[PDB]
Amino acid sequence: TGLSKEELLKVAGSPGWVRTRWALLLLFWLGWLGMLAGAVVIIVRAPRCREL
Amino acid sequence: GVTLQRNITLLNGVAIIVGTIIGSGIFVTPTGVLKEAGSPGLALVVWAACGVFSIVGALCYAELGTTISKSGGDYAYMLEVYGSLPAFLKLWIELLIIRPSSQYIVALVFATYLLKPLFPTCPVPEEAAKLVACLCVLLLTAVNCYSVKAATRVQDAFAAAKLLALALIILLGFVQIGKGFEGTKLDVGNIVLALYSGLFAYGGWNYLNFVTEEMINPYRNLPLAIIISLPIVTLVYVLTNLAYFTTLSTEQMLSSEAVAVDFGNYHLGVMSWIIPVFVGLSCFGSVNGSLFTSSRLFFVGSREGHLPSILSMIHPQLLTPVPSLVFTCVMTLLYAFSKDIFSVINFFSFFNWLCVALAIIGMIWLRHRKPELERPIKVNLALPVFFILACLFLIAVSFWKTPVECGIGFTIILSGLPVYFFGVWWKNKPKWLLQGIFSTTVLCQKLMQVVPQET
Numbered sequence A: 001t002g003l004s005k006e007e008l009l010k011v012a013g014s015p016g017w018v019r020t021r022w023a024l025l026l027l028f029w030l031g032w033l034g035m036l037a038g039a040v041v042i043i044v045r046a047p048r049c050r051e052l
Numbered sequence B: 001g002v003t004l005q006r007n008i009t010l011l012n013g014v015a016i017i018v019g020t021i022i023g024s025g026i027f028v029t030p031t032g033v034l035k036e037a038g039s040p041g042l043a044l045v046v047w048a049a050c051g052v053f054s055i056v057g058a059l060c061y062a063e064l065g066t067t068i069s070k071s072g073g074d075y076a077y078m079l080e081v082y083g084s085l086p087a088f089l090k091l092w093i094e095l096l097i098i099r100p101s102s103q104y105i106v107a108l109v110f111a112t113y114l115l116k117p118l119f120p121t122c123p124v125p126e127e128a129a130k131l132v133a134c135l136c137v138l139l140l141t142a143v144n145c146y147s148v149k150a151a152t153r154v155q156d157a158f159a160a161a162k163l164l165a166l167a168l169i170i171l172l173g174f175v176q177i178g179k180g181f182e183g184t185k186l187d188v189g190n191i192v193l194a195l196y197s198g199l200f201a202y203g204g205w206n207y208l209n210f211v212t213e214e215m216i217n218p219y220r221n222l223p224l225a226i227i228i229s230l231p232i233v234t235l236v237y238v239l240t241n242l243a244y245f246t247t248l249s250t251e252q253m254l255s256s257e258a259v260a261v262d263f264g265n266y267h268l269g270v271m272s273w274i275i276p277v278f279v280g281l282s283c284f285g286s287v288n289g290s291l292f293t294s295s296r297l298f299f300v301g302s303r304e305g306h307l308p309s310i311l312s313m314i315h316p317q318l319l320t321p322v323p324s325l326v327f328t329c330v331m332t333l334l335y336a337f338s339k340d341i342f343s344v345i346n347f348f349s350f351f352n353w354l355c356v357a358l359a360i361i362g363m364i365w366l367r368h369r370k371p372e373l374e375r376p377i378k379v380n381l382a383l384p385v386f387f388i389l390a391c392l393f394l395i396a397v398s399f400w401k402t403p404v405e406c407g408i409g410f411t412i413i414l415s416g417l418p419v420y421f422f423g424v425w426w427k428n429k430p431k432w433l434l435q436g437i438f439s440t441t442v443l444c445q446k447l448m449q450v451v452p453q454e455t
């Protein structure tokens, strides 16, 4: 096991950790939007293939 | 205070099973049954046949999951019979290979078919296909962190997209009849490979059992969600096959690598692109259903002590098992590196049917050992024994198809024995491991604000 419910939540509300979790959530979605921008770049910047 | 709450209503329970059965399979797998049947008649019969077999199996899980209400599904039913080690050897293979490879493969099918109408005549660019697979897996592990009501509303929407797509296919088939048996591979050694290659398209029917514990009313809704779905699937499959045979000749289906797309090209002309996109959105639903369900398997495995304790923790304000989801996403993305992928799943042809056979053998032994345990469902013992006997034959067929590859799979199962002895039998005794385990656990609890569930 690890920390109790109350034992965790009295520490996890500290401003450093609250801003850390906000930063990781922002960084994740920024990284996913960046990966979508990358995927769309590759779909545009590729050879639209030979017509029958 | 903190637990996984009972969010899944009956129609969402039907969504979790129909969404993960219908899969990619029916839009690309018909070719595999014609290859071993030769004849549209024999093909359309084995489609019905492995349908009624699948109903018979699911009726045993409709029993089991009312006798044992644990969300471990196929794993919990082993743990409650064969005990600690046999259940772990399952969970190891599910964790390491089967669930993350399955999730990745069907995400890559989502990526390729959703892009396909930009590239009709040629490959979809591979460096794009692997991103559009990863964006899907990352998105659905975000959605299934945010709310089980969001997760199940997503699968309602995509389960609907799938059945709508098959209704459109069936309708155009009847329209082609409105506009106005053959040479059969009658060898039993051909027929058995036809049947065994068709059963793949029904694979998924057990997946509801891994969320038994989150049903609003499991003792009613868990058997009803099976009987409301597998007969519906079986009908839609025989009708969808019928629809293809109105339009594609045997030679064309034996030699086309995306059967639904050819049927799309013949009927919809300028609008043909609709069917590729529906195969895509169809697979997105199957990634979601798998990620959802899969997160509960590892959760349960950690609650029963087989797996590191972080995966049991829940996020108190959202009531989703955030570390189990995060683990499942990462383990899916680690398959993105592999230059080939279907092979690693083909190594375990036998494994799915083996675990099912062991679960229902378990249900026989459980009836002898404890008749006093409560049973809202009590199926005639003929069906379990029929279904077991049939699976023990298909497990042998699975080896006989490729006696090398099922041996490689069986070799990887034994990789579970090192991990079980190190992770369970050794009691983690060295203090430089034990203190580091704890330090990493309390870090993760802090880092994503998660806490143990309350009995």
Ligand SMILES: Nc1cc(COc2c(Cl)cc(C[C@H](N)C(=O)O)cc2Cl)c2oc(-c3ccccc3)nc2c1
Residues within 6 Å of the ligand: B020, B021, B022, B023, B024, B025, B026, B098, B102, B105, B106, B200, B201, B202, B203, B204, B207, B345, B348, B351, B352
């Ligand atoms: N042991 C095992 C277990 C499962 C999980 O159960 C299944 C599921 Cl979840 C879906 C399908 C295919 C589905 N019925 C479809 O129509 O595409 C088959 C099985 Cl055995 C596997 O999935 C797959 C799989 C799924 C998609 C693409 C390629 C392979 N291999 C599996 C091996």
Ligand SMILES: CC(C)CCC[C@@H](C)[C@H]1CC[C@H]2[C@@H]3CC=C4C[C@@H](O)CC[C@]4(C)[C@H]3CC[C@]12C
Residues within 6 Å of the ligand: A036, A039, A040, A043, A044, B132, B135, B136, B139
């Ligand atoms: C996020 C996950 C779930 C799905 C990602 C799919 C993305 C990569 C796909 C879906 C539809 C696609 C667009 C559809 C049509 C066009 C027009 C064409 O002239 C260039 C590419 C472009 C602009 C595509 C870019 C990539 C695109 C946005």
Ligand SMILES: CC(C)CCC[C@@H](C)[C@H]1CC[C@H]2[C@@H]3CC=C4C[C@@H](O)CC[C@]4(C)[C@H]3CC[C@]12C
Residues within 6 Å of the ligand: A035, B126, B127, B130, B131, B134, B329, B330, B331, B333, B334, B336, B337
């Ligand atoms: C905590 C550690 C294990 C990292 C967790 C995130 C990992 C599994 C994920 C996050 C984003 C992912 C990458 C996203 C995009 C691509 C480009 C693709 O063409 C090849 C794979 C690759 C390079 C992925 C590999 C796996 C990846 C690096």
